[PDB]
Amino acid sequence: MKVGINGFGRIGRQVFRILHSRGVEVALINDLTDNKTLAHLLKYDSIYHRFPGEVAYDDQYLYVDGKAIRATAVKDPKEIPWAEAGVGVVIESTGVFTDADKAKAHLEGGAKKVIITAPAKGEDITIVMGVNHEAYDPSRHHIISNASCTTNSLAPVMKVLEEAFGVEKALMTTVHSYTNDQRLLDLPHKDLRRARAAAINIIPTTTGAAKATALVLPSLKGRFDGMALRVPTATGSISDITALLKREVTAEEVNAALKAAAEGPLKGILAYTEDEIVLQDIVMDPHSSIVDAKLTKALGNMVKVFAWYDNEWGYANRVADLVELVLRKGV
Amino acid sequence: MKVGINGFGRIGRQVFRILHSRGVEVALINDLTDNKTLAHLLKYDSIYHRFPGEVAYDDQYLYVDGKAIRATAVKDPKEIPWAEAGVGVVIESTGVFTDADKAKAHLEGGAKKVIITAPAKGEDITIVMGVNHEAYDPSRHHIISNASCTTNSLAPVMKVLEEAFGVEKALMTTVHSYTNDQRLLDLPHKDLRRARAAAINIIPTTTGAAKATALVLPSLKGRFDGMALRVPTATGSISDITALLKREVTAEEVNAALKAAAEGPLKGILAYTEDEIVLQDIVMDPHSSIVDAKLTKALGNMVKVFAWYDNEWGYANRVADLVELVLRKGV
Amino acid sequence: MKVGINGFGRIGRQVFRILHSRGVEVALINDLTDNKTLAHLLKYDSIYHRFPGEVAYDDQYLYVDGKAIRATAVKDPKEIPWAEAGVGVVIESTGVFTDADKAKAHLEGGAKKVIITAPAKGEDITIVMGVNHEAYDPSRHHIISNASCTTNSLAPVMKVLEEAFGVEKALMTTVHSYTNDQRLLDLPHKDLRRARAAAINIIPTTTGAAKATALVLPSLKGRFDGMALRVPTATGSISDITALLKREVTAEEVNAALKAAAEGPLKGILAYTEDEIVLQDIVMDPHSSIVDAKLTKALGNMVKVFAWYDNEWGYANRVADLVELVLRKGV
Amino acid sequence: MKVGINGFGRIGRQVFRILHSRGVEVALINDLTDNKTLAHLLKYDSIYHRFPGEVAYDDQYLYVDGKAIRATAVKDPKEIPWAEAGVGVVIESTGVFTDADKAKAHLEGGAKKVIITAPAKGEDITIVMGVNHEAYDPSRHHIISNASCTTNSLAPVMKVLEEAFGVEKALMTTVHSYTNDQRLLDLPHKDLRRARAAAINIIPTTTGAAKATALVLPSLKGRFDGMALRVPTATGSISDITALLKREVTAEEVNAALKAAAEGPLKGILAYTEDEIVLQDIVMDPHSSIVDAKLTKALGNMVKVFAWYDNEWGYANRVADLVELVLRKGV
Ligand SMILES: NC(=O)c1ccc[n+]([C@@H]2O[C@H](COP(=O)([O-])OP(=O)(O)OC[C@H]3O[C@@H](n4cnc5c(N)ncnc54)[C@H](O)[C@@H]3O)[C@@H](O)[C@H]2O)c1
Ligand SMILES: NC(=O)c1ccc[n+]([C@@H]2O[C@H](COP(=O)([O-])OP(=O)(O)OC[C@H]3O[C@@H](n4cnc5c(N)ncnc54)[C@H](O)[C@@H]3O)[C@@H](O)[C@H]2O)c1
Ligand SMILES: NC(=O)c1ccc[n+]([C@@H]2O[C@H](COP(=O)([O-])OP(=O)(O)OC[C@H]3O[C@@H](n4cnc5c(N)ncnc54)[C@H](O)[C@@H]3O)[C@@H](O)[C@H]2O)c1
Ligand SMILES: NC(=O)c1ccc[n+]([C@@H]2O[C@H](COP(=O)([O-])OP(=O)(O)OC[C@H]3O[C@@H](n4cnc5c(N)ncnc54)[C@H](O)[C@@H]3O)[C@@H](O)[C@H]2O)c1
């Protein structure tokens, strides 16, 4: 069937640009704004710049290189014209329908599969491409979570570590660009930390990306946890894992294990580099995790690995990848 | 009577800090959050830093320096206990009750005078201290307005220009720190320029600040206009004014007029300096507009003048000065 | 003859990327560092991202896409092997040999022309592509200045305002991203303003960009001047020109002039747009000036135009255009 | 005796303000620039703002509240009149004379003690106040190094972990504000990660701060190590310590330990808080390290702790303190 998107925001537009170049068909887009705003933001992105194609619109459609996309503005999933558009797969990027109770609503909209682009509650399955994607059974799995941007950077690295060396416990910190859940200047928020001026602060905040890695790598259940620090950058992040392994290693063995995963089984998902790169060098990179080899440290069995990831673009490519998988499998 | 504050935000909290240090007694603050958050934001400020005094709170009041202050979470100004609390002067800084129509609600609640800290629609009077405050009339003016931050910075200067030389036409641009009406990252908004990422962009935006100056200095009616460029700083702004005067002058003469005013009549509102300062140097300056004398240029009768202003602190001192005026004349 | 670049920094590398894609042959590059560093900085740029191609090096050469470019590290220009490399045209982008007398040293190295990529002093001719490029006389011009990034944005516009409406007086201000002549945090500088923290201030600094337009447009001699405000952005600027013209006009009228120039005689140099763009949308745009049509204001004869420019990319393209000109006309 | 300061930069000037507010007499300041500049730089600070005193100057002295303070521009330590000023303790804060063999010239010039505000090479001793100042020996120790901002932040925490539970191994990352050894925009540098533009990048960098902790807590030799991440903030850093302890602990045990140290023996050096603060909240805080109580986590015997530190102010205070001890111990 066709793909439909609810929530045309940061992940939403990026997934669109990507699905668009791969030649996947997006038939309807629903946000809470007029088509004129939907088309301006798609044409101009502050981070990824000019859209490479022609964008136009009318009161009911988005026109991209001549193809037409229904763009609506229904604040409720139930009433979104899924079936009538030919949409079997609904990417759900609003950020407000992560309880699978609420995401279920696209189904009686006529949608066949919902893919929550964030961690879900009561979903059918959480998938992280590269790690447990073979776990997908189209007979029983309909409401799928693709996990968070962070859990997708942790999982591929943790998997290599657990298989080559065995992991006993682990803690991690992600130093992350700010996102739209934060304030620009001091302002009321559910979290007294995120309530602060995102661009002139380092903001410690909680995360469950670590705990959630246990969903795709059960062996870590109860042995992985972490924290997050938000910093004044717009997109782009880095995961700082500190693992306690089951044997003694040297940086070279750890790096060598990561590099081989990156050129074999985890190809396209996990990457590995030896250059002296900074944040800007990984922006718009499509990998879920980019191992910066020169930073690895090992104190015997307490090792420390670092993986960069573009929380927008990389995630976005993962959503795209999943959608193609839900599709090739009969959806 | 006692001062209440509806809208505990950026301006709301600085005014409070200023009124608190002056001896005025605030008696109720209303916002949309809980007392914990309120107490917290008051105590810690990313820009003005720590609140100098003890702040605490129960599920009812905030205790600043032991003095309890009622605090509520009422979304409708009509349902606010101003009277019940002994609140004569309400400070409206939520920035949603700017049409004096809705603003009028605080009157039903028991208030006698409302002060909109923004450009209002349908107000009794619009005052800019130092310029036309001698025109406030207790018996007829109930819904005052202290104008915008930018308006407050131009007026003092324009007054000086007009009286000393006379203005024929004048256009201006204000380079201004971002504010809470902008976005962190590209997100929908009514103004498409402001839908964009605030901190990594120079954003042109429209401003009524020049036109609104004509309301306090009527001679400029239809003779003054401007633009605004929002830049990536969190507080502090500068006004670049290009005036076409009625006689040929030298920068020296223009500087001399502006200095004389700063030392005399406008003392306390207009400041003048010859030091080579920069943004951070005016952060937390209470003045309405500071003249950077070394930047004055003059081509005959065409002059260019600049004036920094701290859009949060400077402006908030004006609000306090007015609240304290409205009170010095019986509410 | 071939091109050689002296000073491989922000402008030199961009000019290179461009000369490179245009097929011009750069034979020798000189800076103050090793090839590993020249190669790395070239390969990874924070603003324009990965170099689209292969970069390698050795103790003696930089290999860009398989081509060998002699790369050296000589502090004195008299000592650069221009002759030994076959370099006829040198690009002087160090920023330290702007007094033509010092830049003369290049000719005593075997070089036949020098193009100072900055306002010069003592130059044969200062050329602003599109405005007065026809005056370059190969027979008599050898040390050519391409003027500042700002002058190049003011001249294409002022030229149009002078021919269609006639300019009588003008003052401009340029809100500019910071450059390497500034400081990261407070440090001594010849300029007490530039001595301050570039990324957290708005820094007023002086500029001769206005008076310089008078070299390419003699009619502005004694009639145009300005200022600059450096702000927290990496690259990209905007010029705010306030002109006093000779006839009364309407904004639409002024835009129409600009737009026409933009699609005819100034094609490729000047650009005109009507979309509601912000800074990020003009990064890596190749024009010298991009008229932001919706910003024009007009109070009779006093007009106000705004033109964006990317001080790195735009300027670089102009340097590449001048080099190609110099070459097409016989060295 | 009297204090002399070589290298009036970020640390030099903060140290002066501090020593000045304490009653310590600074007799001579040397740097490489003119007096006008030093004074202006002292008077106006982008981060801590205005110097709260009268600053004036003339061709040979600075004047802070009336006191004359000799000021000079001597490029070589050997040629400094340290003695002619009756200067006994020289604060070597330029950043180029951290090699004791080089800082030794201050002695030749007449001083008796040299305090290098940075990790040295060949120093008689390395002190980190609150941890090992009891080892300073006046008769033997003449060229003292006060360690790095980072070590001073790790040390007190490590001391408390080691004594309460015992540290097996531990690694750490410091998320740190940028500093003057980094670049504003891509420019050659020895470190290719630091050659990159500082204000728009998360720059990974090497630090020996974990290894110097062993110099003061010798039980850590070969059991401690780590990385640094520079971020687009101007001042303030946070340390993220992942320590493997000698027994199973709970977050409370650990914080209980740390709280107790702060209220007790480490008072004034270590601090403890349970508020949900962020970076700006610690700027200008005088403590070497501040435990963010709520950020602590523990997986059995693996713990993670976070401690903030204003790298200019916390440190300059430590520098002031050591100056005070070297004086009280007798020069
Ligand atoms: N940005 C990241 O780095 C990142 C990475 C991976 C996953 N995610 C997750 O993806 C989601 C989207 O985040 P994002 O950054 O794109 O945020 P965003 O705030 O840019 O996008 C949210 C969009 O939803 C729209 N919206 C709000 N309510 C709506 C509704 N009821 N129906 C239709 N449209 C509605 C908003 O108009 C907006 O365009 C969140 O769950 C987020 O946590 C974000
Ligand atoms: N920020 C400045 O530079 C500044 C300066 C001068 C004037 N102004 C004008 O002042 C106003 C305040 O802006 P601010 O910057 O303080 O913004 P803000 O967004 O920081 O303040 C708004 C606060 O009021 C609360 N509020 C919103 N709806 C509420 C309601 N319905 N009833 C009660 N409280 C509610 C919000 O939750 C928040 O606490 C605006 O009108 C603005 O245009 C702002
Ligand atoms: N940055 C811009 O926006 C821009 C735009 C227009 C014009 N310009 C002008 O062009 C020049 C370059 O500015 P930039 O921003 O590229 O500078 P930059 O600081 O980025 O680079 C200058 C390079 O010159 C090298 N260098 C220094 N001295 C040298 C020497 N004596 N011999 C050889 N190489 C030497 C430096 O090591 C450095 O790599 C300046 O004149 C600038 O004023 C800059
Ligand atoms: N800034 C911090 O975060 C921090 C923290 C702890 C330690 N330090 C260490 O302190 C030192 C200074 O750092 P800063 O950040 O104050 O640096 P900075 O670059 O601001 O200070 C340098 C000052 O030293 C002056 N100087 C340089 N060479 C000189 C010389 N030859 N003679 C006299 N004066 C000279 C410079 O002109 C400038 O005034 C470095 O060793 C640094 O690593 C800095």
Side-chain angles (χ1 to χ4, degrees), chain A residues 168-189 191-228:
Chain A
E168 217 214 290
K169 283 197 261 256
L171 283 185
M172 67 95 225
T173 290
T174 179
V175 180
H176 207 274
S177 307
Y178 42 66
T179 48
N180 261 327
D181 69 340
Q182 275 169 264
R183 297 317 187 226
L184 180 65
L185 268 145
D186 287 359
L187 220 53
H189 192 295
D191 178 344
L192 302 178
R193 310 277 196 162
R194 278 185 300 196
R196 319 283 300 266
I200 64 179
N201 281 299
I202 276 172
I203 292 163
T205 198
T206 102
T207 186
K211 275 160 181 174
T213 303
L215 294 168
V216 285
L217 283 166
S219 44
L220 296 187
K221 182 70 187 73
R223 317 168 159 299
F224 197 10
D225 198 11
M227 193 59 80

Side-chain angles (χ1 to χ4, degrees), chain A residues 169-173 175-177 191-193 196 199-207 211 222-227 229 231-233 236-238 240 242-244 248 275-281 292 294-295 297-304 306 308, chain D residues 169-173 175-177 191-194 196 199-205 207 211 222-227 229 231-233 236-238 240 242-244 275-281 292 294-304 306 308:
Chain A
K169 283 197 261 256
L171 283 185
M172 67 95 225
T173 290
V175 180
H176 207 274
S177 307
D191 178 344
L192 302 178
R193 310 277 196 162
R196 319 283 300 266
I200 64 179
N201 281 299
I202 276 172
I203 292 163
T205 198
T206 102
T207 186
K211 275 160 181 174
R223 317 168 159 299
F224 197 10
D225 198 11
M227 193 59 80
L229 293 165
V231 300
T233 57
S237 307
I238 196 171
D240 178 12
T242 298
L244 194 51
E248 303 206 339
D275 295 30
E276 290 183 80
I277 57 158
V278 298
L279 182 76
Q280 298 292 323
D281 300 312
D292 196 332
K294 285 184 157 99
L295 308 179
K297 310 223 97 178
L299 275 190
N301 65 332
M302 169 171 280
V303 66
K304 167 188 281 275
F306 281 89
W308 299 97
Chain D
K169 294 160 174 169
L171 297 147
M172 74 82 184
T173 300
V175 183
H176 205 271
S177 287
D191 193 348
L192 298 189
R193 303 247 201 180
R194 301 200 303 238
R196 305 309 282 282
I200 70 192
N201 264 314
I202 276 179
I203 302 186
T205 223
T207 189
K211 288 152 96 155
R223 300 175 161 316
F224 202 19
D225 202 356
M227 212 74 220
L229 282 162
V231 297
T233 58
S237 297
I238 175 150
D240 175 24
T242 310
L244 188 34
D275 288 345
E276 316 216 50
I277 58 180
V278 301
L279 168 48
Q280 293 293 325
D281 296 323
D292 201 310
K294 278 198 177 75
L295 286 186
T296 306
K297 287 214 152 155
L299 278 196
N301 64 326
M302 191 177 206
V303 114
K304 181 182 267 285
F306 294 74
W308 298 88

Side-chain angles (χ1 to χ4, degrees), chain A residues 186-188, chain B residues 6-12 30-32 74 93-98 117-118 147 149 176 179-180 311-312 315:
Chain A
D186 287 359
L187 220 53
Chain B
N6 187 44
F8 210 47
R10 301 296 311 147
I11 290 300
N30 185 70
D31 210 287
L32 308 180
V74 201
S93 36
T94 72
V96 283
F97 303 126
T98 35
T117 50
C149 38
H176 201 264
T179 50
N180 270 327
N311 51 279
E312 282 197 358
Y315 178 92

